[PDB]
Amino acid sequence: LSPSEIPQRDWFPSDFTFGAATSAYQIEGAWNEDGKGESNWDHFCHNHPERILDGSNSDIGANSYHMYKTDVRLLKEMGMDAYRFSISWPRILPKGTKEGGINPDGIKYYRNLINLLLENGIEPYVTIFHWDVPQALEEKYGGFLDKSHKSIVEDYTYFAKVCFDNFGDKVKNWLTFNDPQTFTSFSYGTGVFAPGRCSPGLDCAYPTGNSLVEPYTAGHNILLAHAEAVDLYNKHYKRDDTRIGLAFDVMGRVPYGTSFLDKQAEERSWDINLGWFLEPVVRGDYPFSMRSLARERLPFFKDEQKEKLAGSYNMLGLNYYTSRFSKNIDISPNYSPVLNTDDAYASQEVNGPDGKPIGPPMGNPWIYMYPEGLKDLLMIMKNKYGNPPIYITENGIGDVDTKETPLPMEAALNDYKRLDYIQRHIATLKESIDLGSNVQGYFAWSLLDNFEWFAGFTERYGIVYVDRNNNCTRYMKESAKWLKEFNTA
Amino acid sequence: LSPSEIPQRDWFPSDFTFGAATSAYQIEGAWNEDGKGESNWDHFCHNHPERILDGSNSDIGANSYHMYKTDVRLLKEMGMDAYRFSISWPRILPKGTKEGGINPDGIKYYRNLINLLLENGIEPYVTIFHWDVPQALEEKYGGFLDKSHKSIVEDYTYFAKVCFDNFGDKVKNWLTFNDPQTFTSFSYGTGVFAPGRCSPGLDCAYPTGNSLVEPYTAGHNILLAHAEAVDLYNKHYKRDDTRIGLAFDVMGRVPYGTSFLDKQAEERSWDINLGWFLEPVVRGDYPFSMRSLARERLPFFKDEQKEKLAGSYNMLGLNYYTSRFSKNIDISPNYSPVLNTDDAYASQEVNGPDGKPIGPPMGNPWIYMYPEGLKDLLMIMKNKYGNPPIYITENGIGDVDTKETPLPMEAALNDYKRLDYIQRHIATLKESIDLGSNVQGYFAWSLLDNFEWFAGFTERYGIVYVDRNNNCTRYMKESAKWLKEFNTA
Numbered sequence: 021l022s023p024s025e026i027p028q029r030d031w032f033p034s035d036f037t038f039g040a041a042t043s044a045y046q047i048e049g050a051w052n053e054d055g056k057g058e059s060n061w062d063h064f065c066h067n068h069p070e071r072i073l074d075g076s077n078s079d080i081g082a083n084s085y086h087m088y089k090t091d092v093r094l095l096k097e098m099g100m101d102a103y104r105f106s107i108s109w110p111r112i113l114p115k116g117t118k119e120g121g122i123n124p125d126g127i128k129y130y131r132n133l134i135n136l137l138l139e140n141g142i143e144p145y146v147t148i149f150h151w152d153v154p155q156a157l158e159e160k161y162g163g164f165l166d167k168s169h170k171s172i173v174e175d176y177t178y179f180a181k182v183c184f185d186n187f188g189d190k191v192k193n194w195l196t197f198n199d200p201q202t203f204t205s206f207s208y209g210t211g212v213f214a215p216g217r218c219s220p221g222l223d224c225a226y227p228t229g230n231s232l233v234e235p236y237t238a239g240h241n242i243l244l245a246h247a248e249a250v251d252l253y254n255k256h257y258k259r260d261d262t263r264i265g266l267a268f269d270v271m272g273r274v275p276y277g278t279s280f281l282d283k284q285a286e287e288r289s290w291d292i293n294l295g296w297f298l299e300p301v302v303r304g305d306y307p308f309s310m311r312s313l314a315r316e317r318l319p320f321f322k323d324e325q326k327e328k329l330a331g332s333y334n335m336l337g338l339n340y341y342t343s344r345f346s347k348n349i350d351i352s353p354n355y356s357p358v359l360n361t362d363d364a365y366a367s368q369e370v371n372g373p374d375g376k377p378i379g380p381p382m383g384n385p386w387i388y389m390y391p392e393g394l395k396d397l398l399m400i401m402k403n404k405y406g407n408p409p410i411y412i413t414e415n416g417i418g419d420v421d422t423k424e425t426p427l428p429m430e431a432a433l434n435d436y437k438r439l440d441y442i443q444r445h446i447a448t449l450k451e452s453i454d455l456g457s458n459v460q461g462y463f464a465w466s467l468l469d470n471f472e473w474f475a476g477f478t479e480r481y482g483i484v485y486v487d488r489n490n491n492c493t494r495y496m497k498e499s500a501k502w503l504k505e506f507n508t509a
Numbered sequence: 510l511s512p513s514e515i516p517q518r519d520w521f522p523s524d525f526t527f528g529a530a531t532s533a534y535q536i537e538g539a540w541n542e543d544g545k546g547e548s549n550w551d552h553f554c555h556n557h558p559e560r561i562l563d564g565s566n567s568d569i570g571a572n573s574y575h576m577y578k579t580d581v582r583l584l585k586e587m588g589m590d591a592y593r594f595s596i597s598w599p600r601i602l603p604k605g606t607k608e609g610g611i612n613p614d615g616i617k618y619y620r621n622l623i624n625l626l627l628e629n630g631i632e633p634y635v636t637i638f639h640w641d642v643p644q645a646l647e648e649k650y651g652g653f654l655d656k657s658h659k660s661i662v663e664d665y666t667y668f669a670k671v672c673f674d675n676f677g678d679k680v681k682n683w684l685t686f687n688d689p690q691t692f693t694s695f696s697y698g699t700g701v702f703a704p705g706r707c708s709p710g711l712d713c714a715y716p717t718g719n720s721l722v723e724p725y726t727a728g729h730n731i732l733l734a735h736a737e738a739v740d741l742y743n744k745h746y747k748r749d750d751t752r753i754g755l756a757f758d759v760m761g762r763v764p765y766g767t768s769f770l771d772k773q774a775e776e777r778s779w780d781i782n783l784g785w786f787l788e789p790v791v792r793g794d795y796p797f798s799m800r801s802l803a804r805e806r807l808p809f810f811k812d813e814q815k816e817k818l819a820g821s822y823n824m825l826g827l828n829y830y831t832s833r834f835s836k837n838i839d840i841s842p843n844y845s846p847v848l849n850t851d852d853a854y855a856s857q858e859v860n861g862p863d864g865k866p867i868g869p870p871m872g873n874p875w876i877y878m879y880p881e882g883l884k885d886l887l888m889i890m891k892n893k894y895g896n897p898p899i900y901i902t903e904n905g906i907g908d909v910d911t912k913e914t915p916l917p918m919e920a921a922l923n924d925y926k927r928l929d930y931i932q933r934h935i936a937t938l939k940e941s942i943d944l945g946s947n948v949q950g951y952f953a954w955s956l957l958d959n960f961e962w963f964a965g966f967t968e969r970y971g972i973v974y975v976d977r978n979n980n981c982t983r984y985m986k987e988s989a990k991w992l993k994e995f996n997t998a
């Protein structure tokens with residue numbers, strides 16, 4: 021990557037935002053201290069260690085509940101403009117409900133972190149929910165599987181309230197949800213995420229759900245929850261200087277072949293991945309393609325739910341990592357969807373028709389570098405969805421570090437493959453910005469190496485190394501080095 | 510229209526084709542002479558004159574069965590390179606079947622017509638089927654409603670063999686079907702065409718069919734029929750110099766508003782109108798949108814049928830008259846398709862959001878001049894469907910002439926509105942051609958004023974006037990005058 025091709029901070033406006041992000045369950049630890057209630061993930065890891073690649077859990081994680089001061093320190097040192105982190109629902113509301121009571125320690129922790137960030141001039145981008153549903157709600161009504169579409173909605177809205185109430189004065193950027201598609205699809209479709217539900221006959225801890233129905237039920241409840249929280253937010257906490265939205269996980273889609281069929285398959289793929297949650301918050305309802313394909317398996321919104329959903333955001337987060345080639349699949353008696361994602365009638369290929377991958381492999385089993393994909397996504401957001409304020413809330417790669425193939429600390433700190441990847445994506449935002457894209461910021465995903473869900477600790481996504489052998493000592497990597505130089509020059 | 514804007518023959522290639530077209534039942538007459546069998550239309554008009562605007566029938570038509578030598582004279586005098594006419598199924602096979610026997614008189618008629626056109630240097634474009642189904646087959650197995658997708662396709666394939674066997678040596682251009690969409694939709698959807706079937710509750714002669722199913726059944730049979738005939742043709746009659754295809758009726762589609770929703774609606778509209786029959790003969794199956802929306806109501810093809818379907822043409826006909834704005838309709842509990850054409854989930858508007866029509870009205874209830882839509886249609890044919898050899902097999906307008914507001918022969922002859930319209934579309938073909946369009950010809954629709962189905966004789970579409978008050982005497986209109994000048998310079 022040419023020396024002049026390498027991004028410079030002056031390439032972006034002075035009001036542009038650069039930061040890093042994390043998620044509560046992945047870094048906090050102290051899973052059962054100071055009154056924090058049990059979460060779906062606490063439950064899943066403890067009860068199904070066999071469902072985690074290396075059978076680990078996040079009881080400690082990056083131990084950020086105790087070491088948050090150092091996290092804010094690395095942020096300051098790197099010269100980061102902002103920090104995106106999430107709030108653990110069960111740590112704020114142990115039972116997840118109002119009557120359950122608010123846990124003062126949870127409030128204290130987040131209150132302290134936020135103040136520390138401000139103190140050092142780092143803007144806090146708070147994600148209210150990042151997959152950590154209080155187990156209490158999970159057993160009471162299955163959480164977001166809530167068939168009534170009322171319970172999980174009200175409890176989330178209240179949770180949202182407790183956050184707005186205790187942090188509204190200090191937090192100017194809110195994100196109700198993060199990666200809603202990954203959450204519903206992996207937790208109820210493939211079953212790789214807590215609680216591990218999937219259609220009978222599939223390989224997951226609880227093969228007694230419905231991969232073709234539950235993800236949509238969960239998704240429906242997430243959208244209702246989001247709408248309700250934004251409604252509450254806009255009415256009592258919103259200030260001219262504050263904003264609220266949600267972040268979507270999305271893989272770019274490129275027509276497998278030159279047939280117009282694959283172009284249609286590609287469109288169905290954007291719809292089922294990004295459109296699923298984006299269109300509802302934009303126009304108030306699911307993509308036409310999804311409704312025509314999922315059918316009754318995709319709930320309908322009430323007229324009053326659509327009004328609330330439509331325009332329920334001031335900004336949008338995009339978590340981009342890789343792209344895929346979408347290959348057409350014809351509707352036929354020979355084909356029956358099994359997973360919610362099959363409803364798109366398109367296979368997502370890593371390799372194009374020439375046998376070469378859409379982009380160079382970044383290390384783990386799924387990330388393939390293709391910054392052009394981010395460009396296409398931003399063009400869609402710009403030309404099709406109103407060109408709203410966009411923040412790349414996640415972007416990065418995971419360095420594999422297994423028991424069988426340990427990543428030497430030396431090799432872990434020399435993360436040049438990560439640096440190249442980051443510099444390239446940042447350059448893409450520059451190209452997109454010149455093209456009229458409304459991108460306002462970029463958050464390197466994973467400030468710290470941490471628990472990676474079903475992958476456990478087999479992957480290091482941080483720009484900051486965490487030596488869990490030595491009390492989780494943090495060491496900046498080369499990528500973090502460059503970011504510092506980038507922000508401080 | 511500017512004089513610099515008037516098309517000149519030298520605008521197009523020397524090999525480009527210019528002609529006029531007609532349909533058997535509309536001009537022929539002699540409905541029951543020389544052993545000609547009864548057709549679905551003979552039957553419909555006779556049994557339900559209330560379903561014809563002026564309660565007429567085409568027993569005589571323009572009397573072209575007895576006056577064909579004149580039609581040819583008219584054609585040569587205008588300088589037409591070709592003439593497209595259809596062959597009456599019942600006139601060749603009175604029982605519509607092989608067992609029924611071939612009617613020698615029917616054969617001799619088209620033998621004389623073909624040879625005469627050829628002796629006079631006019632190329633014949635033979636349309637095998639134009640809605641005239643032998644009433645015998647209709648009563649036998651419902652004709653194209655044939656629920657077993659065998660009888661009808663077999664009988665139709667025999668009919669085509671007969672045509673190839675007796676005219677093959679002289680005909681170099683065949684068209685299996687003409688306007689398949691209009692036939693299935695109007696005969697079984699809205700039921701305004703013979704036999705007049707529609708869903709219970711709908712206003713037609715026999716409200717005991719199924720508007721959401723029969724059109725698709727008939728259409729399925731037409732595609733199968735078309736596939737076998739081309740297979741038969743390719744195997745025993747095709748020559749290096751001959752070609753076979755079919756002509757599609759199609760209205761241009763333009764987004765109603767600027768929403769990406771209407772763009773999607775527009776796409777679903779091209780699909781249900783053009784794609785319905787075009788995609789199957791291009792790739793071997795119906796468009797995805799239709800299968801996802803029509804579902805089980807739209808029959809599936811056997812893998813072997815898809816084989817014969819894909820690539821079953823050497824050229825394609827396009828019958829264009831007007832366009833419509835496609836306005837989005839969401840899938841929802843507040844909507845239920847009633848007609849097959851409603852599966853498109855889009856309302857087709859004449860007036861855009863501003864209240865103005867898509868194009869200036871041409872007189873009858875449906876034609877609105879919009880040459881742009883022809884350009885769009887050709888761009889689609891070029892870029893999406895392989896830019897195959899295209900012939901505009903129909904293009905024109907119908908002048909209103911009812912016994913309430915009769916059209917003075919003089920005014921009927923001074924058809925400047927028709928001329929302006931014709932010149933505009935011919936000009937459009939020039940623009941499209943330079944843009945890469947593979948258009949090879951243009952046929953002005955309606956060589957003669959004739960029977961206009963449910964509109965009966967209330968509309969004069971011919972470029973040549975037929976005075977049925979004087980033994981159907983033919984008189985050239987100004988439009989025919991110009992076409993002569995155009996072809997002869």
Ligand SMILES: COc1ccc2c(c1)O[C@@H](O)C(=O)N2O
Pocket residue numbers: 199202269386472473474475
């Ligand atoms: C190993 O942990 C993950 C495995 C797969 C995924 C993951 C995390 O995060 C999602 O955003 C994602 O798109 N998939 O591909």
Ligand SMILES: COc1ccc2c(c1)O[C@@H](O)C(=O)N2O
Pocket residue numbers: 691758830875961962963964965
């Ligand atoms: C009665 O004459 C007709 C009236 C309407 C139609 C027709 C013929 O055939 C096609 O051109 C068509 O698309 N419709 O609109």
